[PDB]
Every structure is written in structure tokens, then in C-alpha cells.
From a paper:
To analyze the structural basis of the substrate preferences of [name], we assembled a complex of OtDUB1–259 with free [name] and determined the crystal structure of the complex at 2.2 Å resolution. Three [name] molecules bound to each [name] fragment. One [name] is bound to the active site (UbS1, gray) and represents the distal [name] that would remain after cleavage of the proximal [name] at the S1′ site (absent from the structure). The position of UbS1 in the [name] complex is rotated nearly 90° relative to the position of UbS1 in complexes with XopD and SdeA. Overall, UbS1 binding to [name] buries an extensive interface of nearly 1200 Å2, and results in modest conformational changes in [name] (overall RMSD < 1.5 Å) attributable mostly to a slight (~10°) rotation of VR-1 towards UbS1. We also observed the density for two additional [name] molecules: one bound to the side of the [name] that we propose represents the S2 site (pink), and a third [name] molecule (yellow) bound to the backside of VR-1 far from the active site, which likely represents the biochemically identified UBD. The interface between UbS1 and the second [name] (pink) bound to the side of [name] places the C terminus (R74, red sphere) of the latter [name] near K63 of UbS1. The UbS1 itself is sandwiched between two [name] regions: on one side it contacts VR-2, which creates a hydrophobic pocket ([name] I36/V39/L46/T50) for G47 of [name], and on the other, VR-1 uses charged residues ([name] R196/E238/R242) to interact with oppositely charged residues of [name], a noncanonical [name] surface for S1 site interactions. VR-1 folds into a compact helical bundle that presents two antiparallel helices for interaction with the canonical I44 surface patch of [name], the most common site for UBD interactions.
Here we report biochemical and structural data on the [name] domain of [name] [name], hereafter called [name]. Primary sequence analysis revealed conservation of a [name]-like catalytic triad (His76, Asp96, Cys135) and Trp77, suggesting that the Ulp1-like domain is catalytically active and not an acetyltransferase, respectively. [name] preferentially cleaves [name] chains having at least three ubiquitins and efficiently cleaves both K48- and K63-linked chains, unlike other members of this clan that prefer K63 chains. In summary, we have uncovered a unique [name] from the obligate intracellular pathogen [name] that is capable of efficiently cleaving long [name] chains of different linkages and binding [name] with extraordinary affinity.
Residue numbers in the entry:
A (entry chain D), C (entry chain C): 1 to 76
B (entry chain A): 1 to 259
D (entry chain B): 0 to 76
The structure:
């Protein structure tokens, strides 16, 4: 399935994922496509911080869900 | 000498502490509101840090809104408040009670555009203060209204209400300061020369205290059992002061000092 | 085993108890010996408020431990 | 192991060794250790908030290489 990840700069990125993908795996896909290291990445779904060892389906994240990416300040 | 320093004086200049006690009093019970205390446009890293935290929290829906007493670096406060507008738009509302527009503030604007180029800025540019003292009162009032989605006081409303909003806000500040100084002095009698105690040593120091009557102790301990002494936590002068300022017992001691 | 309960009036009361005694049971023993109703009693051990459905051993309360008794106000 | 930075009143930046789970009082004690400034004279700011004793660094989302500020109290008219 597809999901969307919105950044504060207003960039929306579209990801190919599986319900069974871990949060860590999603951050690795973001590094793949955008070059942003996982340790700079905070993922939010509907106001909850996603934790690395959990899956998309743990958070009931489905096709065409939007996540929010909060990036560490200044570089990285 | 030192009018600027006396709370009661009409020329009293609000500090970050005054503004923070006032905003936490009118707003602090709603967790979805971020209350900023200290940020000045002459602190470039701190201003960028502050805007990044708040804009990140609001865009992601970790907070709903933020109220920012912004210091100009020039003995002057302005009001900045940030919420989601229409369509996951971010709207930064601004008013300088002097009526001076944000446009001057190139550092501020560029830092916002860098973090969030899509952010709207609504500069209300409305004159409010009728003297060189009253920015603190109007910034407190402005932030409360902006947080509530209410329009700020107009020039006319502000000319008319200036004394009343200072008087109102200074009534709360006088009372709050007395609750804090009574709580601090009590905290000292119980810390003795420890800068740490557990809630368990607190309970025991209250029992052994040589000053409080048995009824004063019974009231203090009932007041603290209601919200505390659950997990034997480590306290300092500061956390013990705040816990004691929670207390009806301390709020009563303060009530007699003020009347 | 024996435990002690300190009151604000300066009375220490000594109780005969078992590790498996519930907090409710301890308050009933205090009512027995002092005549104070359980629902007026808040017990503290080492800075933790004791909850009715738990046991002494849940709180690692052992022989010759001292608890603190605080009585509710006529109001609050 | 995590490093954070503190900007002091003299304008000097110092580095602290901390954990996310460190209490604010612990951080102020590390500042006193390195710079000799007592906790009760420390107005310690992260992203516009004064850090409160009894909270942790992670309560304020303070992470590796975050900068805290030791500050003078602002006022105005």
C-alpha cells in the first residue's frame, strides 16, 4: 500500500509499505528516498509518536494514511 | 527611586515571570497549549530553537496552540500566537501593543520562512498602550484572547481598559507572589540543610516539625495526600515549593498576609 | 510480626500483623485499638500512600517498620 | 551516553554528559559541578521554556546535541 509523509517545509513524500513494516523500516525507506538519517526523524500519526519496534498495523495505519515527519533542527 | 521595580506602581515593567504566572493562571490547565516563557529576537539560536519546537508540535498535532511573549531585545514585549488555520495551514498571529509592524523584524520573518515557508503571519498592527509601561499587560491580554480565537482589544477599547487590565493582573500577581514566598519559607523549614529530600523524609519532617500546631500539620498533610506521596519521589527547594504552593494550607497563610 | 503507626498527636500505636495482611485489614486493626473508622484513615509507608486492596508485603513492610497515619478533615 | 550543550551567562558553551532519563535537578547539579553556578541561580531554558525540577530531559524532548541556555530574566514596557 501507499502512505504519505508531510514535512514542516510543506514537502509531502509518498512511500510504498506493508502493514507489517516496522517504524524503523519506514524511517529507513525515508533515508533511502530523501537521504535523511533515521536518528533525525520523529514520525507522528494522528498526534501519537510512532515507536521504532512497532508496526504500521499496530497503529492502525492503512492505505493513503498521512504521517507527519518532524526533523531535528539545523542540518543532519 | 525604583518605581519600575515595585509591583503596585503604575510604572512597574512586567518580567518573564510575571507574564508566565499570568498565562499559566489563565491557560495552564489545558495541556494542548504550549506556554513559552523566555525568547528574545536578539537570541538567534534560542529563537530558532523555540520556533522549531512550536511549529513542529503544531504542524504534527502534538500541541493545538502556542502563546509566545516575544521580547524585542529592547525593553519591550510583543504577542505571538500560533495555531492551525484552515486546511492544515499554520497561522502565526502577532501584535506589538505599540502598533509597530512585524516587517522591521527580518530575523524573525526569515527564521519562520526557513522552518515553514507556507506559514501565514497575521500582523494585527494595532496600537494599544498609551504610555511606555503597559506592553506587559496588553501582551498577556492579547495572548489569552488569541488563544481563545477572540479579537484583541482595539485602540479605543485599549485606551479605555488599560488601567483595569493592569489592576486585575497585578491583583493576581500580588496574591501569587505571597503564596510562593510562604511556600518557599515553609520548604526551607522542612529541607533544613538538605537540597534533596524524598516525599518520605518530607512526611517525617512535617511530623517532627516544632512550629506547626497538630491541626496545621493535619491540614498540610491532607492537602498533599490528595495529589502527592504516592511513589516516594525526590524533591528539591523548587519542586517542594511548587508542591506546597498547591496547598490550601499555604494559600490560607498567604490570604492573611494580604488582608 | 509487629509494626508501628505514628499519629500527628504524637501517639505511636503498635500492631500485631502478618505480611499477607491487606491495608484494609490494618485500618480495621487501627479502628479496633484506637476507634478511628477506616474511611477516615490514610496510611503512608516511606512516602507511598498504601491502597486498600494491597498487602503489607506488596510494600515490603517488615517487622518493626513504622507507618504514618493521617486522618481526614471534618471538611477538606 | 549522550552529549548536550549549555550556553552560560559569560557566553561560553560547555558540554555535559547526560542520559535522556536524567532529571532537570541532575542537569543543574552537573552545571554547578563544571561551572560552579548554584542550581537556585540557574534560569535554564530549552526552546523558550524554563526546565522544572522533577521533570526529565526526555519530558522536554531534549536529545543528543541539544543546546540549553542559562539566561537573565527579561522585562519590558
Amino acid at each position: 500500500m501507499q502512505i504519505f509523509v508531510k514535512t514542516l517545509t510543506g514537502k509531502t513524500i509518498t512511500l510504498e509499505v506493508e502493514p507489517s513494516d516496522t517504524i524503523e523500516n519506514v524511517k529507513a525507506k525515508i533515508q533511502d528516498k530523501e537521504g535523511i538519517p533515521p536518528d533525525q526523524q520523529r514520525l507522528i500519526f494522528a498526534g501519537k509518536q510512532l515507536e521504532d519496534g512497532r508496526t504500521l498495523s499496530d497503529y492502525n495505519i492503512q492505505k493513503e494514511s498521512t504521517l507527519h515527519l518532524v526533523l531535528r533542527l539545523r542540518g543532519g | 527611586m525604583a518605581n519600575d521595580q515595585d509591583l503596585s506602581n503604575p510604572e512597574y515593567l512586567y518580567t518573564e515571570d510575571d507574564i508566565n504566572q499570568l498565562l499559566k493562571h489563565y491557560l495552564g490547565l489545558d495541556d494542548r497549549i504550549s506556554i513559552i516563557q523566555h525568547v528574545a529576537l536578539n537570541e538567534s539560536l534560542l529563537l530558532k530553537q523555540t520556533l522549531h519546537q512550536v511549529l513542529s508540535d503544531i504542524f504534527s498535532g502534538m500541541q493545538e496552540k502556542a502563546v509566545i511573549p516575544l521580547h524585542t531585545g529592547n525593553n519591550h514585549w510583543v504577542a505571538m500566537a500560533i495555531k492551525k488555520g484552515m486546511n492544515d495551514d499554520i497561522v502565526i498571529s502577532y501584535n506589538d501593543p505599540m502598533g509597530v509592524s512585524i516587517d522591521d523584524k527580518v530575523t524573525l520573518i526569515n527564521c519562520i520562512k526557513e522552518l515553514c515557508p507556507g506559514a501565514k503571519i497575521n500582523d494585527l498592527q494595532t496600537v494599544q498602550q498609551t504610555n511606555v509601561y503597559d506592553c506587559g499587560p496588553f501582551v498577556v491580554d492579547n495572548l489569552i484572547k488569541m488563544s481563545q480565537g477572540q479579537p484583541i482589544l482595539s485602540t479605543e477599547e485599549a485606551k479605555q481598559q488599560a488601567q483595569n487590565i493592569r489592576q486585575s493582573q497585578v491583583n493576581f500577581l500580588s496574591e501569587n507572589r505571597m503564596i510562593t514566598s510562604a511556600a518557599a519559607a515553609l520548604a526551607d523549614t522542612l529541607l533544613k540543610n538538605n537540597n534533596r529530600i524524598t516525599e518520605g523524609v518530607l512526611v517525617d519532617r512535617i511530623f517532627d516539625n516544632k512550629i506547626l500546631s497538630v491541626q496545621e500539620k493535619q491540614q498540610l498533610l491532607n492537602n498533599l495526600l490528595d495529589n502527592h506521596i504516592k511513589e516516594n519521589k525526590s524533591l528539591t527547594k523548587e519542586s517542594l515549593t511548587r508542591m506546597l504552593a498547591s496547598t490550601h494550607f499555604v494559600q490560607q497563610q498567604a490570604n492573611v498576609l494580604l488582608n
